[PDB]
Design a protein around this ligand. Structure first.
Ligand code: PVH
Ligand code: PVH
Ligand code: PVH
Ligand code: PVH
Ligand code: PVH
Ligand code: PVH
Lengths: 229, 81, 81, 229, 81, 229, 229, 81, 229, 81, 81, 229
């Protein structure tokens, strides 16, 4: 998992991505209160993080070297033999991971929730994988509404995204799903100062991703669907 | 935002500032200013040619994934569930 | 208690205060006042109709358990062993 | 796990339950120093936590939404097929968990210890499960004395409790054992203040559970064996 | 050391002081002075005669190991990976 | 994992062991930048920690009772039947663990790294195990350079150490590898004060292990290869 | 005194009074740099303080009972006999005090300055006193430019105000000139919080006196020249 | 204001918050939040029928003045010059 | 000054002197609300401070060497020639000082007040001085009620004390009246700790002067009217 | 005391602790714990044989007085009026 | 220095750091780091052509003196005696 | 005042001036313990402060604009008519001030002391004034030993300095003596950091004035007796 009264999510609460306001729902899941919870594709939120942390070759505000970052994380490991027929029990061809953020209608009473999933793919067809993935959103949304049921926590929207890789023969794959909980450095906050903590957060809340990018002199790494997971 | 105003009245604040240059820091680390946190979404996968070491294979693959796309390379990852 | 007196002479204190309204907070969270902690005992079990997702099944069941009896519903559980 | 020089346990050190002083030992386990460690049923301590955190429908001083609570936790997952005969390797009919707190004789030198256990039940008779559980106390006490042996930490008393659920066909069960480490909010401390930290703790130390309940205007959730795990 | 001088200019400091008598404390614990940490290397193994409890057997063995050689006996171990 | 801009390692950065400056390389692993990374035996670093924390019977500056110590840890569990022929899937004769520290050439840009490994031993010959272990360094160094590759982090030296135990029939073994992250108490710092934080660290940096030992009135627990893991 | 890089003045920097923007200069004093420093009547600033602290019967955000308030203060005491002819050396009919605030052109380099004056009035005609007072502004402005000369501190505007009382026979009078240095309470800051320090100040900076009055539900004590000193 | 931005880069801040209800506090008093101060202008005069005590006469008159118009009644006035 | 919501007075609020409860009023002064304010002799309070700070030869918890102690202080200086007849204007035979503490009925709204006085004695008869002094209490109480009038602050009791010295020919005297504002050291608080701030104050509040003295192993310096000012 | 309870609700506290050994410290000095203060009553007089230095004569006499009875010998006295 | 070691054992420290750029700050000002102070010696004299204002003449002269030699120009001088 | 357990003096404890170790005594004053207290000319210490704060035209680490600097200060004002014969009571030709620092032999028990003096000069011969001044050291040393007597505080050395100005006809003079109590800025500390407080002080302790000057790139303002007071 959760992020609640103490948090904001990059791409949604701060450095909001235009793709978020433009995003159209994929479908809806019924909640305990009878309201229909719209499910979206978490690509906008995924790209956003890349824009802030930067990449390995184009590093920006990534976590400090050796820092301790608590993360609502999960993952899965699977092996793919050298084309062997007997694939043993838990082995496979591909490995996938998913992450879902559900925002609470009343952030002062209920916490937003993260639901993560991961698994192994047994068939060799990547294209067939994508179908399964689109199908997982249903599975996840199902658990989401179920969890809300448990705490009577109503959400307004939910964003789900996926990641995967297909192994070459004799290769092992690791698909991870992680949500880091960090604190922001001053030089990432335009007109920010260590002496103006709360204002700092407000600046970030008011700046949209592009505005930030431009104000910082950063090119857009998400560009036009340039990022793939 | 107007939400923070309501939050503050509860004694809660979403302030999360890092005192370092360039880098972000993890929630709860000493020296951070504020009692809140910021989060994001990251899903990635990495691979490695199999060796006779299940552990090491997991390590590296779980490192190529951390370094792919959104960088969180040399991080001490603590788990929350 | 008389024990705290001895503890204090060691530089230890069992003070653990939360600055929020109504809610408790976890040991080590920023803003908490004091360098001690309070604990308790909770054992509970939850169920869920099987789906084709082992992970999700664990999640929900491990949520109906957190919400049963003593409430620790929307908590980010960190593990100590 | 452990709780030591920095902590107190709800129902024992603060908000002590009358059931604790009245509780009679179930048996004893021999320690490295030759002393006999009395073993009690942790029901009093279990109920206590419920009285403080409150329940899902009757919420009290539960953890903050989205807060990070470190817990000395463990757990077990098991599945029960739709009456299938071949139950595969690790499946079962019921799932159980246990938690044991052992208080040190000298809390200034040795730390109190938590020992948790969990497992799957293979037979369909709930009544037969209870027998096993009563027998686990012996198993856990054994490990307790063994751990004390390792650090030469002598305990004065130990409290062990259990939880379980029996799955319906095609249902999965999750039995968890957890000990949260929290900090107390002011409005749960009668006559407390943010400006009087140490006094606050003393207030809680001096108030018994009933006294607290009454002073707070809270009904007793543990009532008369009203709580079951 | 001269390295710290460079580190300080980044807003980083490797100061890690415990306010207790004799004992060390973990990184991030309240009351500690400074925003750094100190670490070390520990590898050890412990045993226990098998019982019908896989969990308990793990607990004890994982306790005889913590108490062997370098002592970290009654510690609440949190995991970083 | 990692230890970076915020840390020091006992036996290397503070309380440096003479054995460190005298240690000769076992071999070298090629790094992404073409430099050869010398690999050493982490015995000096292992003993060092023992000198500071002390042992169970000769306790020194060990962690506080019930304290929360975050550790870059891993481990493995294995069982050995009562001489049974059918040892089932994951059982064995012995259990081992390893820990490796790699120091970065530029600690202000790149973090130092910890790589841990653990596994079960299937043959009954301890002497044969040692061979395997000496062989693991190669395996770990391989992963090390591979990880460096991922972050373009060049190291100057790496220290790898092992631990193991061989089970008796019907005995279970647990081999752990752990790197604790702590803060130092004043009475372990000669001429230190709670009022002189930064100076305290410098004192420890300037004192070599023997100097510290002598100044503290501590005997040497590592003596002359007196410690075995 | 002085008020510089760390301060704001009530009625000018925060809770600005409309009377300030509307105020017309009384005259000008030449500064070391050749610029002409406009001199205004500090009545707007005087009334402002009354609006914030409130009066003895209509108390608002006055200093805490028993608090220590450092003040750039000065004062004068004088006696008036029971109509006696021989008025001795330092006695008189009236007693007066003055306060002058001069704002620096570059508050990041030069500090704003307070110059205070006080004295005794020897003639019995109050109306004649006012003339002298109007003439003091000249005397004070003179000293102001002189002090600026000493530190090469150029001011943009200066505000001077006076206070006085005429004693009855056999009565003693005390005329004081004081500039308190305080910190603001949360309930005087609309939409302010203890958790948003820097924002709090900005709120006060943005609110004009009337806006504050209305937002607080306070009547205007300065009303229409209702305050006299 | 835009000026504070420049000030902050110097390590200066004009933050001055009082943790009390209703009342203001003096610069430098403990518990205040921030490292700045706020000021104002106060000029007033008070009288008292002469007694044979020059000191006491000053005290009272210097009290009727503190209580007139802008109230700073029961204050411990420290002097800056 | 004043001492209000943030303070306690040694001998009254903490380390209360038995002489205080036993003290009988000297007379009463009428207050603005028509109540009669009892006036007492501040000897009990004066001795108390000596018991805490100790004396020059028997030092206890006196202020730290070089510390900055803010004091509500006043004083007077006077010279006495070598028996010369022409004593010039402000010279004299003796010099005296007085201090008066008035406690508020409602310490949450009104602050307690200190009124200090000092003057020169022109006649050579010490015995005649004492008469004047007893007469000053009247003068001071008069100003006290007058000041209360100003802030509508009602007091419940007032304690006035004096000090004096008579100069030898060609000697100068200095009579001072001071009320220090300090913070208490831990070793002066029985069973106190730096980790239990608020409790510390409560301990001092509960200990009477003799109890403290005995608990500390301090002899009584005020003994039986052993102190003279 | 019960008064403090009312005071606390206003954000006021009379806590005044000195971190030194034996000695007291002045209100507002850094390092003191708490936001309150303790006071007392001291009246004393001292003398000195006249010299041609009015100032110095005042100094010494005003020093013999500080050292007489209740000791406040080597103190930097700040004035509140 | 070796003296500080003795001082520290009493709970005293002579640390006095200013968080500003270039400028020094006064003892007790908020934001300063440490619980000590540094001092120095300054003696200077200034003049001004007499006017009919004894006070103002004092002000200016007492300003030309503050600005002469060692600069302490725009300072709020508090008095310790 | 005094400067004790919490302080250092510029030119003596930190940024020590070479002139200090080279300075020869002017004379000695007997102390209560029979030891002879050497008296020196405080010129070295006076110049030192100038080197640190800088001058009005060559500003260095002077106090912050508008800061509150507590100072052990004193001063004297005097007027000189337009050659009038009747100079009234307290007027004169010149005005002077003095400052004396006495360092305690045991800074852990006794505080160092500041004794300041000031007065008016009645004769028109400046050269004659100097004689008087050299004579004041005797007067001050006398009071010094006398004050030491009061607290039984033995000093090891004392440094006394003077300042003066002679007024032109119809001119007023103000001679002040002040000892400021400040905290040092990081950019005045070579190799210092806000994160290394105690080390910062040690750096300043180890750097002599010239070394600091050079390391800072500052010219010497005291040069060769270039400063006059
Ligand atoms: N938020 C956690 C899972 C969770 C939800 N409810 C209880 N636990 C997650 O998704 O990542 C670990
Ligand atoms: N306290 C932990 C287990 C433990 C005991 N000794 C080492 N570790 C627990 O019971 O819950 C995780
Ligand atoms: N440092 C961790 C593993 C690691 C390396 N890179 C990413 N994670 C470890 O060795 O122990 C858990
Ligand atoms: N600001 C002070 C006087 C001052 C100006 N320059 C040095 N001192 C004042 O006006 O009130 C005391
Ligand atoms: N408390 C001060 C005087 C005072 C009372 N009211 C305003 N000022 C005192 O008695 O000592 C300086
Ligand atoms: N240090 C003060 C005077 C002093 C000495 N003893 C008590 N008071 C000074 O010299 O300047 C104000």
């Amino acid at each position: 998992x959760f992020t609640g009264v103490q948090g904001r999510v990059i791409g949604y609460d701060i450095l909001r991505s235009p793709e978020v306001d433009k995003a159209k729902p994929l479908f809806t899941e019924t909640q305990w209160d009878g309201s229909e919870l719209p499910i979206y594709d978490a690509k906008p939120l995924q790209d956003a993080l890349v824009e802030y942390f930067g990449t390995e070759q184009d590093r920006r505000h990534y976590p400090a070297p050796g820092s301790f970052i608590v993360c609502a994380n999960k993952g899965v490991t699977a092996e793919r033999p050298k084309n062997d027929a007997d694939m043993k029990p838990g082995q496979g061809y591909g490995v996938w991971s998913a992450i879902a953020i559900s925002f609470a209608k009343d952030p002062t009473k209920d916490s937003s929730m993260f639901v993560e999933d991961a698994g192994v793919w047994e068939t060799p067809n990547e294209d067939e994988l994508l179908e399964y993935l689109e199908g997982r959103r249903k599975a996840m949304a199902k658990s989401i509404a179920e969890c809300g049921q448990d705490a009577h926590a109503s959400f307004e929207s939910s964003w789900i995204g996926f990641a995967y890789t297909m192994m070459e023969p004799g290769q092992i794959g690791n698909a991870i799903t992680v949500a880091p909980y960090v604190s922001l450095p001053i030089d990432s906050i335009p007109g920010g100062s260590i002496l103006t903590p709360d204002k700092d957060m407000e600046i970030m809340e008011n700046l949209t991703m592009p505005e930030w990018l431009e104000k910082m002199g950063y090119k857009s790494l998400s560009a036009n669907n340039a990022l793939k997971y | 935002s107007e939400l923070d105003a309501k939050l503050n009245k509860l004694g809660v604040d979403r302030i999360a500032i890092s005192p370092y240059k360039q880098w972000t820091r993890g929630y709860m680390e000493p020296g951070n200013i504020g009692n809140g946190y910021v989060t994001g979404l990251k899903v990635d996968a990495g691979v490695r040619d199999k060796s006779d070491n299940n552990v090491l294979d997991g390590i590296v693959s779980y490192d190529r994934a951390e370094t792919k796309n959104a960088y969180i390379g040399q991080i001490n990852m603590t788990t929350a569930s």
